[PDB]
Amino acid sequence: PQITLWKRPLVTIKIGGQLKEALIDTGADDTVIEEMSLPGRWKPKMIGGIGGFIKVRQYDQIIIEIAGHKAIGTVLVGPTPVNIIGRNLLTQIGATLNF
């Protein structure tokens, strides 16, 4: 598929048995998901946005399905205002920017 940039590039994802909407974000190094109760162990992390840092829980080896394509990797969970799919997972689905 191709996604234009007139509007925020939102897609459906599946994570932890739930469907959500998420932003395809080439500027994000990491994937950040809104607060949800994912199972198992996690590690504390702080991550920086344009405005400063927030506290998140780092979960490793988490499977996400992104617009029908699987990715496995690290997912950060915390109080983000949007679900963000970052480069760590976008590479796995073969996503590119083109112009």
Ligand X SMILES: CC(C)(C)NC(=O)[C@@H]1CN(Cc2cccnc2)CCN1C[C@@H](O)C[C@@H](Cc1ccccc1)C(=O)N[C@H]1c2ccccc2C[C@H]1O
Residues forming the site for its own copies (CB under 8 A): 1-6, 8-9, 23-29, 32, 47-54, 67, 69, 80-81, 84, 87, 90-91, 93-99
Give the tokens for residue 27. Answer: 């500027």
User: What is the closest distance, in whole angstroms, from the C-beta atom of residue 19 to its own copies in the complex?
Assistant: 19
User: What is the closest distance, in whole angstroms, from the C-beta atom of residue 3 to its own copies in the complex?
Assistant: 4
- For residue 86, count other CB atoms closer than 10 A to its CB: 22
Place of tokens 């976008």: 90
User: What is the closest distance, in whole angstroms, from the C-beta atom of residue 52 to ligand X in the complex?
Assistant: 9
Cβ atoms of 33 and 20 within 8 Å: the answer is: yes
- For residue 77, count other CB atoms closer than 10 A to its CB: 22
Give the residue, chosen from 22, 24, 30, 77, that forms a contact with ligand X under the rule CB under 6 A.
30
- Catalytic sites, residue numbers: 25
